Scaffold this active site. Structure first.
Site, PDB file in Angstrom:
ATOM      1  N   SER A 147      39.956  47.549  45.762  1.00 46.67           N
ATOM      2  CA  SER A 147      41.176  47.987  46.453  1.00 46.67           C
ATOM      3  C   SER A 147      41.851  47.057  47.472  1.00 46.67           C
ATOM      4  O   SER A 147      41.913  47.365  48.664  1.00 46.67           O
ATOM      5  CB  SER A 147      40.934  49.343  47.093  1.00 46.67           C
ATOM      6  OG  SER A 147      40.284  50.185  46.162  1.00 46.67           O
ATOM      7  N   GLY A 148      42.402  45.946  46.988  1.00 46.23           N
ATOM      8  CA  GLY A 148      43.083  45.034  47.886  1.00 46.23           C
ATOM      9  C   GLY A 148      44.314  44.321  47.345  1.00 46.23           C
ATOM     10  O   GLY A 148      45.437  44.835  47.420  1.00 46.23           O
ATOM     11  N   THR A 196      48.792  46.596  42.273  1.00 52.36           N
ATOM     12  CA  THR A 196      49.904  47.521  42.381  1.00 52.36           C
ATOM     13  C   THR A 196      50.962  46.658  41.719  1.00 52.36           C
ATOM     14  O   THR A 196      51.983  47.135  41.226  1.00 52.36           O
ATOM     15  CB  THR A 196      50.254  47.713  43.869  1.00 52.36           C
ATOM     16  OG1 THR A 196      49.084  47.456  44.662  1.00 52.36           O
ATOM     17  CG2 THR A 196      50.714  49.134  44.151  1.00 52.36           C
ATOM     18  N   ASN A 215      36.709  53.678  50.609  1.00 54.19           N
ATOM     19  CA  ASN A 215      37.895  52.923  50.225  1.00 54.19           C
ATOM     20  C   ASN A 215      38.988  53.951  50.354  1.00 54.19           C
ATOM     21  O   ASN A 215      38.687  55.116  50.599  1.00 54.19           O
ATOM     22  CB  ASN A 215      37.795  52.436  48.794  1.00 54.19           C
ATOM     23  CG  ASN A 215      38.982  51.642  48.379  1.00 54.19           C
ATOM     24  OD1 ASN A 215      40.019  52.199  48.009  1.00 54.19           O
ATOM     25  ND2 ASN A 215      38.855  50.325  48.449  1.00 54.19           N
ATOM     26  N   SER A 244      42.297  54.751  45.572  1.00 59.68           N
ATOM     27  CA  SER A 244      41.725  54.588  44.255  1.00 59.68           C
ATOM     28  C   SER A 244      42.362  55.412  43.152  1.00 59.68           C
ATOM     29  O   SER A 244      41.785  56.412  42.747  1.00 59.68           O
ATOM     30  CB  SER A 244      40.220  54.897  44.303  1.00 59.68           C
ATOM     31  OG  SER A 244      39.985  56.228  44.759  1.00 59.68           O
ATOM     32  N   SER A 245      43.535  55.006  42.661  1.00 58.24           N
ATOM     33  CA  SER A 245      44.180  55.744  41.571  1.00 58.24           C
ATOM     34  C   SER A 245      43.027  56.084  40.623  1.00 58.24           C
ATOM     35  O   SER A 245      42.681  55.310  39.737  1.00 58.24           O
ATOM     36  CB  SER A 245      45.234  54.857  40.900  1.00 58.24           C
ATOM     37  OG  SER A 245      46.254  54.534  41.833  1.00 58.24           O
ATOM     38  N   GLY A 291      36.483  49.715  39.023  1.00 56.65           N
ATOM     39  CA  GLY A 291      35.681  48.610  38.541  1.00 56.65           C
ATOM     40  C   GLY A 291      34.210  48.426  38.844  1.00 56.65           C
ATOM     41  O   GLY A 291      33.798  47.379  39.366  1.00 56.65           O
ATOM     42  N   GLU A 311      31.014  50.206  40.693  1.00 57.61           N
ATOM     43  CA  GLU A 311      30.676  50.291  42.090  1.00 57.61           C
ATOM     44  C   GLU A 311      29.172  50.481  42.267  1.00 57.61           C
ATOM     45  O   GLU A 311      28.610  51.463  41.784  1.00 57.61           O
ATOM     46  CB  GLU A 311      31.418  51.465  42.730  1.00 57.61           C
ATOM     47  CG  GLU A 311      31.174  52.812  42.005  1.00 57.61           C
ATOM     48  CD  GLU A 311      32.181  53.905  42.375  1.00 57.61           C
ATOM     49  OE1 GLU A 311      32.157  54.411  43.519  1.00 57.61           O
ATOM     50  OE2 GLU A 311      33.012  54.261  41.513  1.00 57.61           O
TER      51      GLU A 311
END
Ligand code: CA
Lengths: 155, 126, 802
Positions: free
Chosen positions: C178-179, C183, C234, C237-238, C450, C452
């Site tokens: 998530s960075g 998007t 986080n 997270s779609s 992805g 975890e």
């Protein structure tokens, strides 16, 4: 190894000529012996000489004929370079392949890389051998590798 | 050749046994014995004069040679070697010179600005 | 002559000193200098020596030390002739540490896009330098990995090129924790693929309203709404597997959009782990109709939900969302009659209504609440129950022979529900752009969590790891094809094993029939659902019977080791734990869809029928429907950032990135890479760089020269391979061809240096002996004189020549 009498000979005859230029007394200063063999044909390297005596300071250790002779027998062996060998060094520097090297760069190798040659030398060497620049300001190493190997006395 | 066989005036019997000189050489200084005629094995004569005397000139070179001998260490035909160079070519080279041999040599050996002149030296050393 | 380089390419992509005009350092110190791994820092440059036993005691730059290391922790890292590259695949010494620095060396040396085979690792400098512009774009028609340095336009223009060209259909996996900007790219491209999509009429430009690219990530918040944005470990997270499946024409033209989903965390709604907040939107919503009904804001109550934090403000997501709507499929007759349909869930969250003092039955109890949804949704708070708490199975013969159910019947519906009504959003959302007239085929950008691995592992974790893992192997396989050929496209070839199939082992551990999947699945109907029952059972084999997996082992990070067995894929091993798993596979299925039919409200009807099991069931049907939808295409992989938590656009965070790479497939990319024959070079690029190695061993062609240089070296015949244009070397043999060259060049300089100082002595010789005579004369002579002027038969020889 196993010199002869046309070989063991020109040795003493030289050892002699070099035992006198530091005082005739039956011996030769180590340091100056690496310069004994040179004249005597072979082309040993710094390490090479050191690894058999060849001091750094003049007047640290002085070998008498025999005690010297042996260490001469072992310098013969040492990896004596060769065209192809030499020829490559200058090529890995020939960013063109045209067969040249900016004297700049050239005097860099001989000076910087490996066993640094006295900045005293080079100019000397390139100056008898005669290494005239040319337009670009670079040299054609080749004829030089030959020249240097040809010894000071050609044909 | 014979500017040699000269003398025989001033020295002192027949071939002047002892004290040729002495009478002959105190008229000006303050003379020496029995060595300056002890070292006269001989005796006298003119016989092996060219033998004992002289031939003590062995290795004694021409004043054009020795002068040349020096020349090889200055062929910028500057007709000069820098002191130290010589001062070092003798004291530490060939059959090196003893602190005394040296002391004497460079006594009236002409120098200037640190510049030796073999091209007189000889002249003065014969 | 020429080639090319720079100019400006002043992204800079540029050049720190254009390298070899001013370099410093060659001799290197390669038996000496390459990095130790530690931890603060990961690894670090150094010197070596100890020859100890036994570890070491040498060290790094700057600092340092007297530090001890061994042999699994040493590593080594590429002569400068392996400094900041691209393919990274082309890299002797393919070690975990080594890698990195060729990227760190991209941030602190401004640049962040490297290849690692196919992998398009790329970073977030999030300062937004001139990178994406047009004194940039302006080219790559079919320019490949090598006809232009990095950037994705590669994946863009040649997944593109592969499009049209080749024939079939593209794809592409996006990864990045998530960075970064996932998007985007997925966003930053299109712009691309499109610019080059319709730059191969409609001038009025009035059709240029909703834009292209910057359009369908409009819907984002209605999607990404349900959607996603905020979890726990986080925050955005779609939680679904997207796939901007945009369609492609018959004429090398675009031809629409399209887009679906896979794995939407049904769970998310019914269960939740607190900060494990369920889907950004409920809150981003709970004025003018901010009621129109039913309760309103703050958890407290309304479960299946039971709270926001920093610059999250659920504000704008609202008002600033209503309308975007109105450009596609819906006139407030749905838009409006579809939110309740949301709120219609919170209601059931208003749990309980009990059992029986002892009688297995359940009470309709509450039902004062059910009414509302039986008012929102449709039907009537009594329309149900019975065929909901005690129904009738259908040749007719209606039956009614549990309470513990219902809660599930709900913690199933709300799921199933929320599920159906998302497929819904899709249904239409794309409609507007779904000119499904159909003109064959398309690219495809894929997206999904992805892998975890961390602190705790549940039936949650084990799912992604079930995804990615199985995902990966698709990658491997692929790569097993791009090599499988090549050697084939290179006269050489050495049959191997579909690496992709080394992972299977583990994918075929669970999906596998008598895998665990089913021993977990079925074991839900099973009334004796202790969990322990589940535990050992999976054993009753597996543990000691599989090969792949284990029992826990022991501690790693904070807290202790309150584990629960260990399972391992690529990306290492993971310590999962069952408990609330069987409780949660939880999704069962009705009786007239347990009703929802009609209600004359299809807003909740045509989202039903156009049994009694769990979520994994329906998962695998999605997943496979994602594989057996992928395995027939032309993959592409692009990976992402994660430089440094606190977004200091400056740079780094090894472990944090080390973390990542330890997934994606990159580290696993060299693993296989490193297994075969990497390090590739057409002979010409070899002859040169490696001729000092057998100088006097050549005649004085190309593929010939190179051989004597191999043969002359006693090179182990298994370390190399000669195709027919280039030569492949084992893992890091090129290194040795840099330990030698490097050292067997210095040995050539000196040998010369010295061949040229014998020449000076052999020159001074006569000058030298002449000297003797001339000297032995002076001495002799000074002495003859000086012997004289103090003899006597001389001393007084002509005080006066008479
Ligand atoms: Ca001596």
């Amino acid at each position: 190894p196993k010199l002869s009498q046309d070989e063991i000979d020109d040795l003493k005859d030289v050892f002699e000529l070099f035992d006198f230029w530091d005082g005739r007394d039956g011996a030769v200063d180590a340091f100056k012996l690496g310069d004994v063999c040179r004249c005597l044909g072979i082309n040993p390297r710094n390490e090479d000489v050191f690894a058999v005596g060849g001091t750094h300071k003049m007047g640290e250790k002085s070998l008498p004929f025999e005690e010297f002779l042996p260490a001469y027998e072992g310098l013969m062996d040492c990896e004596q370079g060769t065209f192809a060998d030499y020829m490559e060094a200058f090529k890995t520097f020939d960013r063109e392949g045209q067969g040249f090297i900016s004297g700049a760069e050239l005097r860099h190798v001989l000076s910087g890389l490996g066993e640094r040659l006295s900045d005293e030398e080079v100019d000397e060497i390139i100056n008898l051998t005669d290494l005239q620049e040319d337009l670009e300001g670079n040299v054609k190493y080749e004829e030089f590798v030959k020249k240097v190997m040809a010894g000071p006395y050609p044909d | 050749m014979q500017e040699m066989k000269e003398a025989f005036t001033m020295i002192d019997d027949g071939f002047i046994d002892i004290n040729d000189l002495k009478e002959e050489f105190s008229s000006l200084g303050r003379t020496p014995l029995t060595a300056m005629l002890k070292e006269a094995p001989g005796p006298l004569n003119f016989t092996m004069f060219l033998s004992i005397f002289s031939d003590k000139l062995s290795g004694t070179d021409s004043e054009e040679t020795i002068r040349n001998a020096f020349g090889m260490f200055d062929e910028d035909a500057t007709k000069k070697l820098n002191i130290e160079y010589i001062k070092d070519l003798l004291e530490n080279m060939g059959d090196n010179f003893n602190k005394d041999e040296m002391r004497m040599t460079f006594k009236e050996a002409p120098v200037e600005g640190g510049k030796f002149d073999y091209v007189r030296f000889v002249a003065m050393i014969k | 002559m020429n080639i090319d380089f720079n100019d400006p390419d002043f992204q800079y992509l540029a050049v720190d000193r254009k390298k070899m005009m001013k370099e410093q350092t060659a001799p290197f110190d390669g038996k000496k200098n390459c990095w130790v791994p530690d931890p603060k820092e990961g690894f670090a440059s150094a010197e070596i020596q100890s020859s100890k036993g036994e570890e070491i005691t040498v060290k790094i730059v700057s600092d340092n030390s007297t530090r001890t290391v061994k042999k699994d922790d040493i590593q080594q890292m590429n002569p400068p002739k392996f400094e900041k590259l691209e393919d990274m695949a082309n890299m002797t010494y393919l070690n975990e540490a080594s890698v990195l620095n060729n990227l760190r060396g991209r941030y602190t040396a401004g640049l962040i896009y490297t290849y690692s085979g196919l992998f398009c690792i790329a970073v977030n400098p999030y300062r937004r330098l001139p990178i994406y512009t047009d004194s940039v774009i302006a080219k790559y028609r079919g320019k490949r990995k090598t006809e232009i340095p990095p950037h994705l336009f590669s994946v863009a223009d040649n997944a593109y090129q592969n499009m049209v060209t080749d024939r079939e259909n593209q794809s592409c996996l996006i990864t990045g924790e998530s960075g970064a900007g996932k998007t985007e790219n997925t966003k930053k491209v299109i712009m691309y693929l499109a610019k080059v999509a319709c730059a191969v009429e409609e001038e009025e430009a009035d059709q240029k309203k909703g834009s292209l690219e910057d359009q369908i990530i409009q819907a984002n918040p209605v999607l990404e709404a349900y959607g996603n944005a905020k979890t726990t470990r986080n925050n955005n997270s779609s939680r679904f597997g997207k796939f901007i499946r945009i369609h492609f024409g018959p004429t090398g033209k675009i031809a629409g959009a399209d887009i679906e989903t896979y794995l939407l965390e049904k769970s998310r709604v019914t269960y939740q782990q607190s900060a494990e907040r369920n889907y950004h939107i409920f809150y981003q919503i709970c004025p003018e109709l901010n009621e129109v009904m039913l309760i309103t804001p703050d958890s407290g109550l309304y479960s299946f939900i039971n709270l926001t934090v920093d610059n999250i403000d659920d504000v704008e997501e609202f008002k600033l969302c209503d309308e975007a709507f109105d450009i596609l499929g819906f006139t407030k007759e749905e838009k409006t009659s579809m939110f309740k349909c949301t709120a219609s869930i919170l209601h059931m969250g208003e749990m309980k209504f009990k059992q029986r003092p002892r009688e297995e039955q359940a009470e309709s109890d509450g039902t004062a609440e059910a009414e509302k949804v039986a008012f929102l949704c449709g039907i009537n708070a009594g329309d149900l129950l019975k065929a909901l708490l005690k129904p009738k199975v259908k040749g007719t013969e209606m039956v009614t022979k549990n309470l513990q159910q219902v809660i599930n019947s709900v913690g199933a519906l709300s799921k199933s529900l929320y599920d159906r009504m998302f497929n819904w959003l899709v249904k239409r959302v794309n409609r507007t752009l779904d000119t499904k007239a159909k003109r064959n085929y398309y690219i495809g950008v894929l997206d999904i969590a992805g892998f975890e691995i961390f602190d705790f592992n549940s039936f949650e974790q084990l799912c992604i790891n079930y995804t990615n893992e199985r995902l990966q192997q698709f990658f491997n396989h692929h790569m097993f094809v791009l090599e499988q050929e090549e050697y084939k496209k290179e006269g050489i070839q050495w049959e191997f094993i579909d690496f992709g199939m080394d992972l299977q082992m583990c994918i075929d551990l669970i999906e596998k029939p008598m895998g665990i999947l089913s021993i977990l699945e079925e074991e839900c109907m099973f009334p004796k659902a202790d969990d322990k029952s589940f535990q050992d059972y999976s054993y009753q084999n597996h543990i000691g019977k599989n090969r792949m997996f284990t029992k826990p082992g022991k501690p790693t990070r904070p807290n202790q080791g309150h584990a629960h067995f260990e399972l391992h894929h690529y990306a290492g091993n993971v310590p999962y734990s069952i408990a609330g798993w069987l409780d949660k596979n939880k999704d069962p299925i009705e009786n007239v869809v347990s009703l929802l039919a009609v209600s004359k409200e299809p807003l909740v009807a045509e989202l039903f029928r156009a049994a009694f099991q769990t979520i994994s069931a329906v998962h695998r049907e999605s997943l496979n429907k994602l594989m057996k939808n992928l395995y027939s295409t032309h993959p592409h992989f692009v990976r992402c950032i994660i430089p440094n938590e606190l977004k200091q656009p400056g740079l780094v965070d090894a472990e944090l990135v080390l973390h990542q790479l330890q997934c994606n497939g990159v580290l696993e990319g060299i693993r296989i890479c490193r297994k075969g024959f990497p390090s590739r070079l057409i002979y010409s690029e070899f002859k040169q760089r490696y001729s000092i190695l057998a100088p006097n061993a050549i005649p004085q062609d190309g593929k010939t020269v190179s051989e004597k240089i191999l043969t002359g070296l006693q090179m182990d015949p298994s370390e190399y391979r000669l195709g027919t244009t280039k030569v492949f070397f084992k893992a890091g043999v090129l290194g040795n061809l840099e330990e030698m060259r490097d050292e067997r060049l210095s040995k050539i300089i000196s040998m010369f240096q010295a061949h040229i100082r014998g020449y000076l002595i052999r020159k001074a010789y006569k000058k030298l002996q002449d000297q003797r005579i001339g000297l032995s004369v002076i001495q002799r002579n000074i002495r003859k004189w000086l012997v004289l002027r103090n003899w006597q038969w001389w001393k007084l020889y002509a005080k006066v020549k008479p």
